């Protein structure tokens, strides 16, 4: 059996709204320390890994590892029926093929009880080794989102270049080209976090923006984003969830 009670349910609402537009079906590997998820695109080009740990819940309880096959579109449709101030509780019986979602209202007046039909799905998961990346940039979420959106209007491919001083984003299309430069800003405030660029080796690579605009749908989850990259390896975009865990998007480079 599985039963979890999460107070700040906006987290689940925002997670599903962030990942609903990339993957349609996904298996949820319910572990003992929390919930994990790992999946690929409809084009087998990027990988998403979400991690939420039991310490972040108000009542975590799991008995046996389960892999719940969910239609992400239906999951987001159901979660849209809950407010960002609701208390969301997930429940699944021992031998059952349905997931139960319960939303508690702030004034206890409203109680919502939805139940969605699950589907079978095996675990096609690629193990990600923990590497050390050449460059790691930590920037504001809104800044990254604006950069990706703006650069989408020029062309369809971005050239990320890193140097000791800062990181530069380039693009080119039918109506010309554009370039944006960010630098290690003033050290006063870590919230509008100056690009915190840890340089180990020089880096410059190319990516597709469509999947980046898919990625940036997870912006409302955190206020700071960490983009990690090295030569000829997939970039990691890490959105840190408060206490609970994180959500990482891996994207393969264009060579």
């Amino acid at each position: 059996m599985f039963e979890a009670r999460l107070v700040q349910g906006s987290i689940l609402k925002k997670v599903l709204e962030a990942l609903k537009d990339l993957i349609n079906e996904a298996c949820w590997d319910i572990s003992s320390s929390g919930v994990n998820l790992q999946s690929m695109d409809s084009s087998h080009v990027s990988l998403v890994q979400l991690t939420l740990r039991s310490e972040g819940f108000d009542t975590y309880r799991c008995d046996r590892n389960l892999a719940m096959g969910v239609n992400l579109t239906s999951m987001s449709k159901i979660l849209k029926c809950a407010g960002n101030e609701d208390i969301i509780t997930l429940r699944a019986e021992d031998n059952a093929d349905t997931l139960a979602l319960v939303f508690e209202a702030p004034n206890q007046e409203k109680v919502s009880d939805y139940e969605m039909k699950l589907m079978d799905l095996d675990v096609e998961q690629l193990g990600i080794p923990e590497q050390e990346y050449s460059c790691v940039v930590k920037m504001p979420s809104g800044e990254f989102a604006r950069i990706c959106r703006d650069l989408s209007h020029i062309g369809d491919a971005v050239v990320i270049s890193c140097a000791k001083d800062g990181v530069k984003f380039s693009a080119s299309g039918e109506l010309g080209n554009g370039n944006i430069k960010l630098s290690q800003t003033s050290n006063v405030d870590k919230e509008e976090e100056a690009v915190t660029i840890e340089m180990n080796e020089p880096v410059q690579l190319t990516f597709a923006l469509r999947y980046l605009n898919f990625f940036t749908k997870a912006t409302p989850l955190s206020s700071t984003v960490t983009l990690s990259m090295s030569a000829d390896v997939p970039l990691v975009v890490e959105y840190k969830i408060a206490d609970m865990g994180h959500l990482k998007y891996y994207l393969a480079p264009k060579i």
């Binding site: 690929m40 087998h44 080009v45 990027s46 990988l47 096609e124 998961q125 690629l126 193990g127 990600i128 190319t206 597709a208 390896v233 997939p234 891996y250 994207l251 393969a252 480079p253 264009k254 060579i255």
Partner: peptide, 11 residues
């Protein structure tokens, strides 16, 4: 381009 993306992970 246009990697791939199983090139560096498998299972």
């Amino acid at each position: 381009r246009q990697c791939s993306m199983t090139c560096f992970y498998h299972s």
